[PDB]
Each structure stands twice: as C-alpha cells, then as structure tokens.
Symmetry: D2
Subunit: 290 residues, 4 copies
Amino acid sequence: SLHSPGKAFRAALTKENPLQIVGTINANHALLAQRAGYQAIYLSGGGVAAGSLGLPDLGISTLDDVLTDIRRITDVCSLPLLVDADIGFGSSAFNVARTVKSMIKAGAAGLHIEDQVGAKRCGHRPNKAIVSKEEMVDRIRAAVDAKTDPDFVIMARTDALAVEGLDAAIERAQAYVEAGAEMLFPEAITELAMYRQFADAVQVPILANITEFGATPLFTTDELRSAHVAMALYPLSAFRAMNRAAEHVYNVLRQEGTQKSVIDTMQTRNELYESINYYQYEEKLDNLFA
Amino acid sequence: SLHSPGKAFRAALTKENPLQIVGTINANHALLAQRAGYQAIYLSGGGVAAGSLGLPDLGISTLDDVLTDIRRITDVCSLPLLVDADIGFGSSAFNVARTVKSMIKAGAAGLHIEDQVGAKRCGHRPNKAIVSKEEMVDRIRAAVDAKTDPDFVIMARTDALAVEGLDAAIERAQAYVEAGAEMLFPEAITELAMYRQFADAVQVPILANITEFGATPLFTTDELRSAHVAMALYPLSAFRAMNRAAEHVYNVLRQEGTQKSVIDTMQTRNELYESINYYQYEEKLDNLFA
Amino acid sequence: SLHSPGKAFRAALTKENPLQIVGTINANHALLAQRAGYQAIYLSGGGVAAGSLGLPDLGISTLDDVLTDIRRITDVCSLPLLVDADIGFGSSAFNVARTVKSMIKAGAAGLHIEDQVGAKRCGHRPNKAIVSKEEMVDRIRAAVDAKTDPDFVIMARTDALAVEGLDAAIERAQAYVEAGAEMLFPEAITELAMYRQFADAVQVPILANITEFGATPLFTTDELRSAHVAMALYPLSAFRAMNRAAEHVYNVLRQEGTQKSVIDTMQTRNELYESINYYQYEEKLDNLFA
Amino acid sequence: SLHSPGKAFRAALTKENPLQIVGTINANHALLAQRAGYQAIYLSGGGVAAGSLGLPDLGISTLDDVLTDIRRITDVCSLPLLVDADIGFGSSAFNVARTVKSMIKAGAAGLHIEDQVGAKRCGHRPNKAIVSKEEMVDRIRAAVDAKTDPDFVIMARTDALAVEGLDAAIERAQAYVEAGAEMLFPEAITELAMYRQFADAVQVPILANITEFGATPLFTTDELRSAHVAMALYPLSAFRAMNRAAEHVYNVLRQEGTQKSVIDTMQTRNELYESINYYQYEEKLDNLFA
C-alpha cells in the first residue's frame, strides 16, 4: 500500500507519550530534527509568516505560502508533519475543503484549524475574537468531510480560554470533538491541572503548546505525561535560537568588518554536508551506474 | 521613475568601500540584515538548496525554487538583492534569458552566472570543469541582452583560477567584461595581491567571496579595500550560525524533556516583533482609518 | 524610465473610444488578442476559476491562482492587463494591500475590486449582498495606498444598481471615486442612458461589461461611445467559443474513433507557430551569435 | 488503500483497446474530456509551452510550469493523467528523480521521457538530435528507481526514426524496455505496419501519437487495434480547435465592434455551469449543514 503520513503520525503517537512535536522552519531544520531523534515535526503558521515571509502572524500569509513550505519539507524529510492551518484560509466550506485536500496532496500528515474570527472588516485590528461554537462545528465538519486520506489528522484548536474562561473552552472542546475533531489543541493553558480536565472531558488525544514566551509555563514531558497530555509542541523554539544566532553574526560582521570572532558559533561545512546527506548522493550514482 | 533594485545596488557600491553583502537565507533574515545596517543582501544558491530544500548544492534546485525565495525576500525587504543564478538554469540562450527576465520581475537587483560546465550525462559525478571562454562569452551575451531593466546587474563568476592558472583566469575575465559582464566574481583567491591583479585587469567592480571553512582566508573589509575589491560577500555566515543554534535546541529539548535550559539562547518575543516591524501594522490601520 | 503596464493602459484609453478590452484565458490567447490588434486585455476571475481550476466562480480561487496566470500572460505579452481581484483576496486591509502589491509585481496594469460581501459563515450560500458604502470606501483606500507604481489602476466595481436602485448606485460611485477609485465598473446596466448617467456623475472613465448570456444587451462600441463609456469589456467571449470547439472535438473523436472529420475546425500548425512568434527564436540566436 | 492514479491508468488500459488518451490543455478541458467519456487524459509538453506560457516547445518551460498544470487538472478531475516530461527537466539523475517524485506527488498517473538531446551550448539551435542508447538507458533507470508509487507509469519515448531509421529505433526501444521502461512511445511513425513491428519487438504496451499535422497519418482506432497498438494519443486536438474558435471571436469583435455574429459559436452560460458542476456545490452545502 501507499504510505500515509497521517498513519505515521498516529503511529508515532502510539509509540511516544507524550509525543514531542518540534517546529521546523524549513526543510533543513526538519532534517536536523529527524537527526536529533524526533518522530514528528511541525509547520508553524506564525513561522511561515515571520520566517518565510518576514510578516507578522496577522492572516497575511496565504495557503500557497504554506503549501510550498509543506512540499519543501516533506519532499526531503519523511517524518510526519502537523500543519498549522489557521482558520482554513477562506470563509467558505469550499475553502476549508480545498485547503484540507491541497495540504494532504502536498504531503502533510495532519493539520489543526482553530475557532478564531480573523478580520471582519477592512479596518478590523488584529484580534483574538472567536466564532460561535456552532460556526466552529461547521468548519470542523467541512474539514473532516474533505479528508481524502482517512488517516490524515484533523485537530481542532480552541482559543476560548482567554475570552470565555475555562468551563466554556472545555464545553466548546466537547462540541468540537463531537463534530468530528480527532485531537484537541487547547490554547494558552496556564496550569497542569487544566490539561487533565480537557483530557478528561474529551476522549481524544490533547496537545499542549509549550511555546517560548506566552501564557503557558515551560512544562516538562514528565509533568505533561502526568496531566494525561498526548503531545508536547514546541512550535518556534529552534527558530528563535536561529534568529539570535544570525543576528549576532550580522552585528559582529558589521561592527568588526570580519566574521572571525563568531566562527566558533557556526555549523561547519562538514557538518552541513552530513546534515543534508551530501555523500549519500555520490552513493546514489554509484548504485545506479558509472 | 519606478524604483529600480539594480540602480540602488550600484548606488550602494558608492556608499561603502568595500560594500558588505550578506547572505540572507529567508525574508526574516533579510530584515535582520537591514536592521543591522546593511545596504545590500545576497541569495546563495547553495543556501536555497541546503536551507530551503534541504538538498546538497549539486544543481537540483531549479529556477522556481530560487524565484520563490526572491519574491518572499524582496516583497518585504527593500534592500537590493544580488542572486546566485548558477549557469542560467538551462543550457540554452533561451533559458538564460527567461532566467534573467524572471529574476528581475521577481524583484532581484542583480545576478551572477558562472562558467561552470555542470552535469553532462545522467551519470555525471560532481566535477570542476569550465566551459570554453567563447561559450561563457555567449552565456554572458544572452544574459545582458535579456535585461528588461537597464540597471539590473549581470555579474560573471569564474572558477578559472583554480582550473587554468592566474593569467588564463585574467584572460577570461577581460573577455567576459568585453562581452558585457558588469562586475566580476573571481573564485578561489588566497592572496590579497591577486585581487589587486584582477582589479587592475578589468575596469568593473570585483567581488571577494569571504565564505567560511574554505581555502580562502577571512580577509577584513580594510584588507579588501587595500586590494581594490569593491564588495565583500558573506554568502552563508548567518545560516551556518542559525543551524548550530537550532541543532543545539533540538538536542537539548530531546535530552532534557524541556527547553528551559536554552531559553537564554533565544531571540525574545519583543525582538521578534521589532524585527518584523510588527507595530507598523496597527499604525498603518490608524493612519488609513478611524 | 522603467516600463509601466498601468501607464500604457491609461494611454490605451486615449487611443480608442471606447477601448476594447478582451478577456484572455491564458498566455496563448493574450498573444492571439495582440495579433488581432487589441491594445488591452483582461484576466477574468470567473475565467481563472472555471478554465484554470475547473471550478465555479464561488470564491474558491485564491490570489496565488490569479498571480500565476498574471505572470504567464504578462511574461510573454506586453499588452496592459486589467485584473479581476474580487474583493481583495482577504477581509483585512493587510490582504488588500498584499494583493495590490503582488499583482503589480506579477505584471498587471490594473485591477478592480468590488463591494460584494462574499461568504460570511462556513455554510453561507451564494448571495448578492454588498458591504456598506463606508466599508467599500475603506477597501478602496487600502488599495490605492498600497500602489507601488503610481500609474497602476484601481478600478471600483459595484453591483449597487441591482441591489439598491440607480440613485444609491450613483451615490456609492461618487463616494468610491472620492475615496480614490480611478475608474468605475458599474454592473447590471441594461440601458445606454444609464451609462450616460454614471458617466455624468463621476469624472473617471467608466467600463461597460458586455458579457454574453446575461441581462445586459450586446451593445456595440458605437452605441457605447454615444453613452460616454470609456471601455468595452468582453470577459469570457473567446473562452466560451474555445470550450465549444474543444467539446465538439472530444465528442467527434470519441464517436468516430478519429478526428479526421474535424481537422477543418483546427488552427493549422503554421498558424500556431506564427501566433507564438516561433520564428523569432532562431532569429534571436542568429542575431546574438554566429 | 489510498488511490493510485497510475493503477487507474493501467486499469483503463486493460479495459479499452486501444485506450484513447486525449490532450487536455487545462482543468476545464479535462472535465469536458471526462464528460465525453474518455478514461485517461494527457498533459502535452508542447501545450504547456504554447498554451500556458505562450512559448514555442523549445525547452523553455520548467518543471514548475508543468507541476502547476498537473495539480490544477488532477485536483478537480479524477481521470488518470499521462504527463509529457520531455527529457526529465535537468541533465543529472538527481534531476530525473526529483521530476519523477514531484510529478507523482502532484497527482499524475505516469509520464514519458524521451531520448532527445535538448541544447548542448548556449547558441545550440532547436534540434531533434538524440543521445546515445546508453545515455537513454541511464535516464530510464534513474526514472524507474525514483517511482514512489510502484504503479506510477514510466513510459519511454524514442525520436530515433527521423535521424537513425526504423531498425535502429526498434533496437533502441528494446534496450529502453530492457532498462525498465514500462510502455513505449515510438515517435513519428509513418506506416501502420511499423507499429506492429514495435509491438512485436517489445513486450510492453505501445502508444501511437495521432497528432494533428505531422508525419503520422490520422489512423483510426480500428486500424491501430489491428496494428496491436495499445493506446491512441491526441495531444493537442482540442487545443487547436479552441485556438481557431478564440481567434475568430477576437477577429470578429475587433472587425465589427460587437460579438453578435459569433454568439452561436459559444458554449452557453448554462453549459459552462453544467460542465464545472456548478450546482453540485449548492448540494455540498445542503448535505453538510444549513
């Protein structure tokens, strides 16, 4: 049978608990993550915006921007890839479906769609408002109905904690899973106990977003495991470090007129070749001919 | 008149001596380069291959992979971008021209094409051969002829020094310039005096590739100015540092079950927002509307 | 100065009265239009949806699908191209601007945005509602502000006549123009006198959509000139004819087991070659080289 | 199991004899072909060049141009799609592989790669020279080794008749199949008897290119069946008719200032809606919600 990246994502879930899922900004970093041992990786929507487009995460990126990053990554790295699909790239059910199908075809193992509103008017400032529960149930149903690969994962993310409180966020989660959501991503959780409540309310795996500088403390895998969390997500960790490292290089080069003093911060040429399996290419040729 | 990235590039050469040109792997890093004060940036061919595609620099990347990175970068960053165009993405004058016109429309300020032979047969193993002086002259002729913007830059890159000795290298350079080459990128120089020799032989600005872990010394901008070099290129510097920092994070997070111990290696959220001009978006809305 | 597709478009309006603008479904047809003598062409939104994607005109096509057709067309055909941008490909001023800047860089001469509401909820059924006059004014303001080429055209399209009656339609048009709209595309007019009324109310060129099988009569260029209309648009005309001819071939070939009986309905090989300037390629080679 | 378009292509081969495979210039025409009853369709390389890019078929199009046409078509039409992959879009085995994998991922059921040389020097005029037998065997092996879906079809096309005669073309064909080719495409065959000779020399299915104005007469499906031909190909038939129909529309509109006299040559609005299953969209919404 043909390989199903979703199938592999769900398998990796069965094998690791919690499953650590790391953000990979580009194909090169996906290889680095694969080498470090991860079993699943991630395409952050904020990273596509900030890193690939140099834009804030305000809904400016398009499906196309994300699709090309998904292909670049999955063309060279076989690890299953979870994709941040925002609110579906379009208001209509027709848009949600095209996004789902395009993403599966581009190579992704799954995606998460959230309940945010986006922008309602040309001058609508960036906001965290969320649609009604019903509206989100409709997005979820449209997305699930669109799965062309039964094993592709449709995860539902809720940002209801900040604007409606815990009990309402949990309640929405139960309705989302009821509508078809296969996994749950409760955003900005503040206490380990809350995760357990979500774990207990919905009988599907839950993801905990362990991002760098927000509302959620830096919970360990052991702590998350105790809270019955099925996945730990680090959406931009590598990216943040990469930026500081590049910045420092740019600054020193500009200040000193040579990079001599930051050489020791650099991945060597040999290391880079190892990372992209440079020599496995010479092998491919030897195996095929000459 | 309409803005010309090429003209601005030529203008940058007059404002700095030598002009520092730093490789920017993506849109985000082009902005960090601009905020660090640079007046010109670069899109490394090996960088597109290794970072964007996770592939070795063996001619697998296509024009389209490079175009995408050109647009992402130049759509948000106004600095003139010099692009590595390998041999023109195709063996025919028709390919060279389509490449030039496409790179211009995508937003580039200039590009360099080299006299490399490339892959001859399907089973061709990586080799360092160069086409005849006449053949490169034809490539250069096709490139200049295709310019749709008179100020766009056609730079010729030659690896003749390591292949045919100095004098022959200089003989090619003179013929390349006479063919219309507007700037020269001589590869593999290990002594300042040599740069002076190229500078003396051709009346076009010359570029010094100060990349790491190669045969060439880490010359300083002042040393370079003393040899009459017009621009100093640092093709993958920030990239090499970003990979190491990212790698370090993936490993530490995997071993420790938390990234807590490497937070101090990360660009802060405020630094992220500032780097991508986050605050200019709401300011834009207030300026346009009520 | 650098060539401006927008400027050339504005210049076309002065050379013809009214300016005939024909929809060109692809690069090939843009060239047939140019060889037929036209001085301006059009990229229909429904055309990109129906011909390029094989989808109904229900807002499924994205900015990226339209950009690809803009580049393919303008990369080879120098005629100014007017583009259907629906409502800006996004609900935020940030989307409108990214759309304008992208269409300009892709090669377009101008675009029109309309005051349609679009899909509100995921389950929204096709509807003909329009935003408030103020909301469209904001969209128009964001669009004009984003122009990177001063001569690029921002045309406002309104379906207010069929929704709110003539006077209200004219009231919106005046406000749209005051907001910076450079040309007007009033929908659903069935009488020449009405065009004259719009022309009289706003001091900007007005466009008459002479599409087939709709509520509007097949007005002639002379009738249109008598009503003060500056340009006559034929959005899908050649497209509708091409599909029928193609359909006829598929059916005849399937029934007969040979296309022999429909050869006389086909563009000859000489006509193909001439249409795509085939002979200019070898001429280019002889002109550049030995 | 997941759907394999190659599997469906091979199935359609088993069911029809000869299998009629029709060229579809865009997604819309793929739907028309599906409606006319075809069981397999085709993406002509000359059509991507002439129709999508408005360029002659001289190796100017890139893999990217073809990949976007493959996605557009297969995203909306489920018929299996045979793709013209020229010589593999790149000289290296690494290029042949990336093309094969990219095309499978984009949705294609199979492709054909030929033994032409392309351009050897910048000024190399368009030609029909072909590589040695060995060189083509290497391309074929690289392509087969790259199949990510065992059912994807790798067809080998030979243009050796025009430059080496029949016996040599047959001999190459035997070597190509020996190297891994799954089907054979002998170009520009002039007599029914020749096909039978190919059919007899290689024990894999053979395709007969029944194109519009070349060396091959317009053989019927019955005649081809008698020659043991497994597939009949009509690469541009629909496209040629579509062009004449569009041209006539452009001319009449320009000459008469109205399209009234060519209305009867147009596919109606209702027909277009039927063709793109416009109303099946209203059904999707009714099934999902509201």
